[PDB]
Design a binder for these strands. Structure first.
Ligand code: MG
Ligand code: MG
Ligand code: MG
Ligand code: MG
Ligand code: MG
Ligand code: MG
Ligand code: MG
Ligand code: MG
Ligand code: MG
Ligand code: MG
Ligand code: MG
Ligand code: MG
Length: 132
RNA sequence: GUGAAAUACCACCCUGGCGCGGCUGGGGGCCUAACCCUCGGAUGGGGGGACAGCGCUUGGCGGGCAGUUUGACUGGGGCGG
């Protein structure tokens, strides 16, 4: 852990829960990268991956453009693009792919479908945030 | 590049571990002051001691007791059927 991270996670809270349009203006500032950042928001998933009847995939494309699947640990990963679009074209876009993801929920998925969501980068720290 | 997986700063997760803390269940030891026993004497001393005893509750063992059941046919009834 370098010092770019020492002022990264000192400037943001994994302690305090946040919302999605509140924390989406902080997405380009908290990446100190030397180049080429791509922003990744993540969610833990409320399904049992050992049951393949609960599995999901497809190709659905973001409104903006470049520039979703469940693994055997039952969590979520997906690229939305390249750094590109600024805070207000992201907070605008930050509700776009999530609600497009909720439409894949298998029936036998027991419990809260999106367990916890931290907005982060490939370059950046943990921020408690709400998909809402 | 002879394994399909890429060996970066990252979160999101699995799996176990310890670390702190929040809620916590469980054990041991010591104490005394409730409670108990005792003390020619006591607003006290000694002994036991949060046990025991007692309340409410759980499940159990339980002829020591209680209420009862223990069929009809039948060349008498039972036995047999
Ligand atoms: Mg003692
Ligand atoms: Mg005394
Ligand atoms: Mg005493
Ligand atoms: Mg007691
Ligand atoms: Mg009996
Ligand atoms: Mg009797
Ligand atoms: Mg009677
Ligand atoms: Mg008879
Ligand atoms: Mg006859
Ligand atoms: Mg006769
Ligand atoms: Mg007879
Ligand atoms: Mg008979």
């Amino acid at each position: 852990h370098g010092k770019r991270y020492r002022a990264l996670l000192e400037k943001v809270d994994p302690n305090k829960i946040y919302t999605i349009d509140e924390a989406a203006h902080l997405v380009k500032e908290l990446a100190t990268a030397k180049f080429d950042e791509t922003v990744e928001v993540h969610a833990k998933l409320g399904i049992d991956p050992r049951r393949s009847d609960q599995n999901v995939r497809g190709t659905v494309s973001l409104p903006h453009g470049l520039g979703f699947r469940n693994d055997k640990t039952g969590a979520i990963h997906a690229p939305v693009g390249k750094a590109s679009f600024p805070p207000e074209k992201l907070a605008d876009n930050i509700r776009a792919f999530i609600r497009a993801l909720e439409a894949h929920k298998p029936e036998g998925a027991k419990g809260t479908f999106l367990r916890s969501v931290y907005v982060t980068t490939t370059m950046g720290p943990s921020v408690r945030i709400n998909p809402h």
